[PDB]
Structure formats: structure tokens, C-alpha cells
Ligand binder design. Structure first.
Ligand SMILES: *[C@@H]1O[C@H](CO)[C@@H](O[C@@H]2O[C@H](CO)[C@@H](O)[C@H](O)[C@H]2NC(C)=O)[C@H](O)[C@H]1NC(C)=O
Ligand SMILES: *[C@@H]1O[C@H](CO)[C@@H](O)[C@H](O)[C@H]1NC(C)=O
Ligand SMILES: *[C@@H]1O[C@H](CO)[C@@H](O)[C@H](O)[C@H]1NC(C)=O
Ligand SMILES: *[C@@H]1O[C@H](CO)[C@@H](O)[C@H](O)[C@H]1NC(C)=O
Ligand SMILES: *[C@@H]1O[C@H](CO)[C@@H](O)[C@H](O)[C@H]1NC(C)=O
Ligand SMILES: *[C@@H]1O[C@H](CO)[C@@H](O)[C@H](O)[C@H]1NC(C)=O
Ligand SMILES: *[C@@H]1O[C@H](CO)[C@@H](O)[C@H](O)[C@H]1NC(C)=O
Ligand SMILES: *[C@@H]1O[C@H](CO)[C@@H](O)[C@H](O)[C@H]1NC(C)=O
Ligand SMILES: *[C@@H]1O[C@H](CO)[C@@H](O)[C@H](O)[C@H]1NC(C)=O
Ligand SMILES: *[C@@H]1O[C@H](CO)[C@@H](O)[C@H](O)[C@H]1NC(C)=O
Ligand SMILES: *[C@@H]1O[C@H](CO)[C@@H](O)[C@H](O)[C@H]1NC(C)=O
Lengths: 413, 65, 98, 98, 49, 48
């Protein structure tokens, strides 16, 4: 009937998300793969038409798409913001996410563990280097961290505007529906919890065996595709031998033409299958990259009100980190804890009038009614300042009798 | 020439993507016009073909207090 | 056969129905609290008053039209059954997949 | 430029949305489908390379994807909540959905 | 072999489409069932409750 | 037609215009279309 539970404490938490953004760029030459160092076969290969042009166009498109994905995900900011030399932010410690001052590679320590944890001119098969180097992506990430720490969400919607980090956290608590004094009397506790959570993420990433499986998946898929493409080159495909020189040597040209055609057909089919699988995988990776860019904008540059988009709990802020083929998000959220039961009422009947809370809920403490906010237990005396009156006491089901204090009442003179 | 150390077969410049012949390397950084690879782009000087390292953006520092 | 077989799904329909029942019970009994941490109970009338405050309408509107709102919800839920039953192409997408 | 319209009543409505979540898991047999369980053909079939491994890998990946889809959609709740035995929620009829 | 390869390719394309639909359904669950959504026409026509 | 009230946007609940539901911002010769009316002050009749 009239039971409600309100949390009396909270625990702020940090969680990790891994998202692939791009895959390797591969280029394939037909003649070398199908039949290389043999101009005799090269003469016959031209008879099949424009298959090579189609294959090269498809590979070039899915190679350009990777640079497009990386640019879309990481080049969100227009200017390279720099962190102040004094790394004091009201008790919050960002040493594990900011770049290392000793400058071994201009990477944060967590980024170092990410780059160490995940592994990262063949027979006609080549790989192309990505347009953006790891240093440039790390620089973009550093700019994003500096902007989101120094200015808040203002830098992502216009000119960058500085604000102390404590006041930014007060803004964010106001955003999640909790008053700012809750931060102002618990700043030290919140800073300690944040530092402990960052340390726990450090240890969990250092210790987990299969935390970064989503990038190993892409790397292994590319490796197995290339390996099976090379392995298929040794199959007979119905000919007497898999060596083109051998079939030229051991048979007459008119009879060897059929076996050459069989080899050509088999190798072309295998290469076409490779291209099709690459196209499908590229589509999947493009969808993942679009998701990563959307998450970057929503969670890093702002504060999303969507439920589970930026981690479990009420979202406060997020921090991006770089990975060899993806991005890593550290979502800081607010989780209530230590809840207590009270008995509640929908309205207060006073002087034949129904009073409703303005921005809170009625709780009774058993024998004394108060007004408190929903997400944190903080009782207060019911007055006319925090309640509004509308209607009589006969329309509301469950109304209860109590007195409403009038601030101007004691001023009788 | 992709993947070739062009110490083997006007200005000649060596890149992680390959060896570039006919483009002059300049130490200035501009926005990318023609992406070559490994962070090096090329453009028309306006006059000649030049190669350079792309610039991510303008440097900025917010006065945090 | 000709070598073409079908594998059974890991989750049976009973398990999915159990998950759905858990979600319904949680959302009816605790609102949106169960999806963000510990599940905190709250009377349904107050939860719906909060949900009216969420769309820009004051809660006294609900506290004065509770019976009407309940009747409208009940009529709509009752009509959903007939709407699904009578329509011959309501579940067209799943049939298309099959 | 000096006229507005403000509603004086309201109607609450319930609508249905249907979304496919998964499809059928299928398996294939190379020798049974192609060679028809004939010994002469099987020896010739292994000469064609590793196409069958590719097909088996693809179908296995599809099946695991279907299972992951179902788990992602339906297993979002940590605990199995239970509704109270006294099903009175201030005038509402959830019998059609419980 | 060609017939079987064609079947596999069509199955892969359909699996990708079904995966997209399942991701949409999961997002709908998280944002409409576990909370109240302010996005327009995402959880039905009207002001979502 | 004759009197002026304040209502919430999504529902018709007329209220008397007071100082509680209104805030003052500058003089009344800049806003285009501003009209003439009285604002009720609940404090004066009490005379604290
Ligand atoms: C607002 O609309 C509702 C819905 O039509 C009205 O409730 C109906 O009122 C009539 C006449 O009293 C009854 O015959 C119906 O049975 C009611 N419907 C339901 C679902 O209870 C209500 O009267 C309207 N209110 C105003 C002020 O216009
Ligand atoms: C249950 O609680 C509600 C909320 O106060 C109240 O309006 C209703 O009358 C109660 N019903 C019973 C049977 O106690
Ligand atoms: C921040 O944390 C690191 C590692 O826990 C520690 O070495 C450093 O001293 C901390 N910062 C301050 C200002 O104490
Ligand atoms: C709610 O908390 C109170 C403590 O104030 C306790 O006495 C009561 O048994 C609790 N009820 C439930 C259902 O947990
Ligand atoms: C709240 O309840 C406790 C126990 O019932 C009581 O001791 C205390 O005085 C109450 N609070 C106030 C402000 O009276
Ligand atoms: C509240 O007090 C009034 C008298 O001021 C009385 O008529 C009414 O019955 C009381 N309400 C309850 C629930 O006892
Ligand atoms: C090319 O060879 C020279 C000398 O052997 C070497 O210094 C250089 O690093 C090589 N280039 C690449 C891209 O490896
Ligand atoms: C660029 O810098 C290098 C390194 O000193 C130098 O050798 C080269 O001449 C410079 N080129 C131009 C165009 O300044
Ligand atoms: C309102 O619209 C009418 C018709 O166009 C126009 O004559 C009048 O000036 C407008 N009022 C204002 C205040 O602009
Ligand atoms: C609520 O609606 C269901 C659906 O028809 C009905 O069976 C049930 O009796 C109703 N509840 C009550 C308490 O009558
Ligand atoms: C409003 O009242 C003021 C003084 O009371 C007067 O000067 C002004 O003309 C009035 N405006 C209109 C539109 O009547």
C-alpha cells in the first residue's frame, strides 16, 4: 500500500567497454596469385574479362572505408587542447589516464597495457599502412581528455569554457537528479571512491585473461582468411598436378589447356570468396565504428540520459582510451546503496486542502512526516515553500492528515 | 612504389608506405589533400608536388584555475 | 535427409518466458529503479504520478483522475487482445523469417 | 500571432511493436549432399581443397551469433524478480500480461 | 559446390540483417522498458509513459 | 476573453497570476505584444 525505499548512501563506479573501429587494409594482385612467373598463363588469364578490376575496386573501397571509420571516430575535436602543468583537480587523480610525463611513447599507462595485451609482401598478398599512426590517435585522445577535464561539456558545443572540476561534478549530480550540496559535503569521499575505482580498473585490465577478445577476434579472422587463401593455391582442382610448370612439362598444350582452365577457375573462385567475406566483415566493422562514434559524442562530449548507453547506473562522465584497432571507454556512473524503508503518502491534507510535494516525496519516519528527494535520503520540515496546494481533501485516495508549517506565521507582529 | 626500399630500383623520399619519386618533402604541416599513408600527405604547392606530415589541428590551451 | 539438419536453440521458450516475467515483475513493483542498481519498491500510483511529471504534466492530474486513467488503460489492454487476434498480418515479420 | 490551443482532456493508448531477434540454426554435410554417400566420389571430393571447412566455420559462427542475439536481448536482468501474491496495483488490470 | 556456396553467402547476409534487428530490439528494451524515454516516436506514438 | 490566467502547456489548469508563478525581467517597453494586467501579491493582504 504505502511502502517506499530510499537509498541513504551511494557508490560511484567505473566500467570498461571495448569496441573495434577498423581492420587491416589488404591489396591483392591477380596474376601473381593465380599464376605468377608464367607469361604463358598470363596470356590466357586476360580472356576472362574484367574480374580483376572488380576485385581491385572492392578491395580499394573497403580499404578507404577503414580510414573513413577512424577519422569519423577519433577526429571529433577541432583543436588540440592541453592539460595545465598543475595536475590538481580538487582531489581527483587522473594520472592513470593522462599521458606519461616521462614521454616514452606519449601514452597513458592504461593505454600501455592495452597496447601490450593485444597482438598487432606475401605471395601476391600485401597489407597497407593506415593513414593515422598510433601517435596521432593517442594525441587525439589526449586532446579529448584535456578538453573534457578542463572545460566539461562546453568544449564540444562551441567555445571551450573553463570551470573548476568540483563545480562540474556538482553540475553532473544536478543532471542525474541529486542536489549539489550532496557533492559539496562528500567531495573527499567521492574523490576517494573515484581513485579506488580507477585502481580497480587498472588491476582488472592487467589481470583478466580475455578482456580484449573483441580485437583478437578481428586479427585472427584476418589471419585465417589470408592463410586459407594462400593454402588453397596448392589444391589440384581436378588437374593432374597443382604446379603449372609441371603440367606444362608433362603434357601437350592442347590437352594442358583444359587443366590450365580448371586451375584458373578454382583459383578465381577462391579469390572471389575471399573478397566477398571481406566485404561482409567490412560492413560489420563499419557498423561497429558508427556505434563507437555515436558513443564518443554522446558519453564523452556530454551526459546521456539514455538508460544503459553509457554503462550501468546513472551516467556522470566517460573517458576515452586508445587500442590498436579500437577504442576503450571508461564510464563513471552513480549507483545508490544502503536503502531504507519508510511509509509514504500521496498528499498532505491541511486546512481542508491537498498539498503535493514540488520536487520530492513524502516520508513518515514512522511518526513524523518529512519531504525528501527521491535518489538520496535527506528529510526536511514540510512547509509552504516546498509544497503546492491544488484541490480539496476529498478527491485524493490515500491522503493523510498533518500540519504544514508557514514560514511567515511566526512574524505575527 | 609500395613496400619497396628504393635504395633498390626529381626528389626521392622514403616513407613507411613506400618510396616516393617526384615529390619534395617540406617540414611545414598542412591539412591532408592527397593521403599517401603512414601520416604523410601530398598536395600541389601552387607550382610543384610537395609531401608533408598532416596537422591534426590548431594548438590550444585552456586557462584552468 | 540430404545432409541438412537443424540445431535446437540454447534457450527454451520457457526460459525466455521466465526472463520476461522477471522483467514485468521488476518494472511493475519497482519502477525504473531495478535497472540502475538496487530495486526499490514504490506504489504504482506514485510511480505513474512520477511518469506524468516526466512528460510535463503535474501529478495532481493523476491523483484526481486515477480512476479514469485506470479504466482507459484497462480498455486499451483489453482491446490489444482483439487487435492482435483479428489482424491476419500482425506477426508478418517472424512468419517472413520462418 | 495571438492565439493558442490547449488540450482539456487526454487519452492513454497502447500500441504493439514486433521485432525479430533470431533465426534458425542450420548445419550442412558436404559428402552427404554432394557425393550422395558414394565412395568413388568422396576420394575425388577431398581433392578440391578446404571449402568444407570454410562452410562449417561460417555456419557455426551464424549459430553462435543467433545464441548471442537471444542472450543480449532477453538476459538483461540480473535477478529473477517475483510479483506479490496479492495482485492489486491501485485499479490496474495486468492479468493479460502476467 | 557452387549451389552450396551461394546458400552460405545468402545465410551470412540474412544473419547480418537479423543481428541489426536484434541490436535494435535490445536498445528498445533498455530504453523503453527499464526507463522512460524522451526520444520522439522511439517507444510509440505520443508522450511515452 | 475577459480575464488572464496561467496554465501549464499540456493541460488546461487556469491559475491566478501571482508573484509566485511569474518573474520580473526589465521594463515593459521592449517585449513586442506585452499587454496590460494586474499581478496579485499574496503577501500584502496578510500584512505581516
Ligand atoms: C475525458 O475523456 C474521457 C474518455 O472519453 C471521458 O470519460 C468518459 O465519460 C463518458 C461520459 O461521462 C463515459 O460514458 C465514458 O465511459 C467515459 N470513458 C471512460 C474510459 O471512463 C471523460 O468524461 C472526459 N472528460 C472531460 C472533462 O472531457
Ligand atoms: C492500499 O494503499 C493505497 C495507498 O495509500 C490506498 O489508497 C488503498 O486504499 C490501500 N488499500 C487497502 C485495501 O488497504
Ligand atoms: C595519483 O595516483 C598515483 C598512483 O596511485 C600516485 O602515485 C600519485 O601520487 C597520485 N597523485 C597524487 C597527487 O598523490
Ligand atoms: C523495511 O525496513 C524497516 C526498517 O525501518 C524494517 O523494520 C522492515 O522490516 C523492512 N521491510 C522489508 C519488507 O524489508
Ligand atoms: C524519527 O523517528 C525516530 C524513531 O521513531 C525518532 O526517535 C525521531 O525523533 C524521529 N525524528 C524526528 C525529527 O522526530
Ligand atoms: C483529518 O482531519 C479532519 C478534521 O480536520 C477529519 O474530518 C478527517 O476525518 C481526518 N482524516 C483522517 C484520515 O482521519
Ligand atoms: C630501407 O633501408 C635502409 C637501409 O637498409 C633502412 O635504414 C630503412 O629503415 C629502410 N626502410 C624501411 C621502411 O624499412
Ligand atoms: C626538412 O627538414 C629536414 C631535416 O633537417 C631537412 O633535411 C630538409 O632539407 C627540410 N626541408 C625543407 C623543405 O625545409
Ligand atoms: C499578426 O498578424 C497579422 C496578419 O498578418 C498582422 O497584421 C499583425 O501585424 C501581426 N501582429 C504582430 C504583433 O506582428
Ligand atoms: C483485471 O483485469 C483482468 C483481465 O480481464 C480481470 O480478469 C481481473 O479480474 C481484473 N482485476 C480485478 C481485481 O477484477
Ligand atoms: C498600459 O498602461 C500604461 C499605464 O498604466 C499606459 O501608459 C499604456 O498605454 C497601456 N497600454 C495599453 C496597450 O493600453
Amino acid at each position: 500500500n504505502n511502502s517506499i525505499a530510499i537509498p541513504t548512501n551511494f557508490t560511484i563506479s567505473v566500467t570498461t567497454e571495448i569496441l573495434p573501429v577498423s581492420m587491416t587494409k589488404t591489396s591483392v594482385d591477380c596474376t601473381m596469385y593465380i599464376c605468377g612467373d608464367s607469361t604463358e598463363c598470363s596470356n590466357l588469364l586476360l580472356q576472362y574479362g574484367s574480374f580483376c578490376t572488380q576485385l581491385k575496386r572492392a578491395l580499394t573501397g573497403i580499404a578507404v572505408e577503414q580510414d573513413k571509420n577512424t577519422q569519423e571516430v577519433f577526429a571529433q575535436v577541432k583543436q588540440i587542447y592541453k592539460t595545465p602543468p598543475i595536475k590538481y583537480f580538487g582531489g581527483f587523480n587522473f594520472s592513470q589516464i593522462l599521458p606519461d610525463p616521462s614521454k616514452p611513447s606519449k601514452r597513458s599507462f592504461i593505454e600501455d597495457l592495452l597496447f601490450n595485451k593485444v597482438t598487432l609482401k606475401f605471395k601476391g598478398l600485401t597489407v597497407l599502412p593506415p593513414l593515422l599512426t598510433d601517435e596521432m590517435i593517442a594525441q587525439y585522445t589526449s586532446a579529448l581528455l584535456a578538453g573534457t577535464i578542463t572545460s566539461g561539456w562546453t568544449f564540444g558545443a562551441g567555445a571551450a569554457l573553463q570551470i573548476p572540476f568540483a563545480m562540474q561534478m556538482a553540475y553532473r549530480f544536478n543532471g542525474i537528479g541529486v542536489t549539489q550540496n550532496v557533492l559539496y559535503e562528500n567531495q573527499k569521499l567521492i574523490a576517494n571512491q573515484f581513485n579506488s575505482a580507477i585502481g580497480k580498473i587498472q588491476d582488472s585490465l592487467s589481470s583478466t585473461a580475455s578482456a580484449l577478445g573483441k580485437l583478437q577476434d578481428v586479427v585472427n579472422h584476418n589471419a585465417q582468411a589470408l592463410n586459407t587463401l594462400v593454402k588453397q593455391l596448392s589444391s589440384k582442382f581436378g588437374a593432374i598436378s597443382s604446379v603449372l610448370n609441371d603440367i606444362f612439362s608433362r603434357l601437350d598444350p592442347p590437352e594442358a589447356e583444359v587443366q590450365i582452365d580448371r586451375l584458373i577457375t578454382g583459383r578465381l573462385q577462391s579469390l572471389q570468396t575471399y573478397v566477398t567475406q571481406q566485404l561482409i566483415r567490412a560492413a560489420e566493422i563499419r557498423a561497429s565504428a558508427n556505434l563507437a562514434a555515436t558513443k564518443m559524442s554522446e558519453c564523452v562530449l556530454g551526459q546521456s540520459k539514455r538508460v544503459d548507453f553509457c554503462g550501468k547506473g546513472y551516467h556522470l562522465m566517460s573517458f576515452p582510451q586508445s587500442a590498436p584497432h579500437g577504442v576503450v571507454f571508461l564510464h563513471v556512473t552513480y549507483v545508490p546503496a544502503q536503502e531504507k524503508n519508510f511509509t509514504t503518502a500521496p498528499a498532505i491534507c491541511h486546512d481542508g486542502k491537498a498539498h503535493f510535494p514540488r520536487e520530492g516525496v513524502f516520508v513518515s519516519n514512522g511518526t513524523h512526516w518529512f519531504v525528501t528527494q527521491r535518489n538520496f535520503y535527506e528529510p526536511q520540515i514540510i512547509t509552504t515553500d516546498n509544497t503546492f496546494v491544488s484541490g480539496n481533501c476529498d478527491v485524493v485516495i490515500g491522503i493523510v492528515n498533518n500540519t504544514v508549517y508557514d514560514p511567515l506565521q511566526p512574524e505575527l507582529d | 612504389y609500395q613496400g619497396v626500399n628504393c635504395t633498390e630500383v626529381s626528389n626521392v623520399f622514403q616513407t613507411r608506405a613506400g618510396c616516393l619519386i617526384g615529390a619534395e618533402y617540406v617540414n611545414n604541416s598542412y591539412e591532408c589533400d592527397i593521403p599517401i599513408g603512414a601520416g604523410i600527405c601530398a598536395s600541389y604547392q601552387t607550382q610543384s608536388i610537395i609531401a608533408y606530415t598532416m596537422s591534426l589541428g590548431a594548438e590550444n590551451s585552456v586557462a584552468y584555475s
